[PDB]
Paper text:
The A3 evasin [name]-[name] ([name]-A) bound to CC chemokines and inhibited their receptor activation. Structures of chemokine-bound [name]-A revealed a deep hydrophobic pocket, unique to A3 evasins, that interacts with the residue immediately following the CC motif of the chemokine.
To verify the contribution of the CC + 1 residue to affinity, we mutated this residue to Ala in [name], CCL11 and CCL16. The complex of [name]-A with [name]([name]) is isostructural with the wild type [name] complex, except in the immediate vicinity of the mutation, indicating that the affinity increase can, indeed, be attributed to changes in side chain interactions. Thus, we conclude that the preference of [name]-A for CCL16 over [name] and CCL11 is because the aromatic residues in the latter two chemokines are energetically disfavoured, a phenomenon known as negative selection.
Author numbering:
A (entry chain B): 7 to 70
B (entry chain A): 22 to 103
Write the structure that this text describes.
Amino acid sequence: TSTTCCARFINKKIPKQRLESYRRTTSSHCPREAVIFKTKLDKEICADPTQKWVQDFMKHLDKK
Amino acid sequence: ARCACPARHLNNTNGTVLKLLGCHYFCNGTLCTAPDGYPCYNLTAQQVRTLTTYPNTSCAVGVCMKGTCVKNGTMEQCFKTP
């Protein structure tokens, strides 16, 4: 059971051009459900998976 | 923005959400504070000194308010996982 969790979420949408192919889903046991993405500047960013931008990117990464 | 990054939480044998140790975390080169209402563990200095990979103390559950883990009365068997 991974104990890495996101306390806060990125407020706005991040253009896909700014994101790498990194992605990890956090435990369902986390206080807040989050997906972790990485920017081309190598910053890990917590994203709310109930926002459609996030859902769109996760799909885009599977289709790749 | 910079504080939207993952951080290590503590687990428990109680079947409840993972919780932050205290209300502060460091990621993306930034010292951050958890949001108000965030579930946290408030451990004594002595409890922190003995914190391990298995439960060995009663851990005070709390809620983050302005960087302070305000104890709520609930106790749990907390532990860390690398």
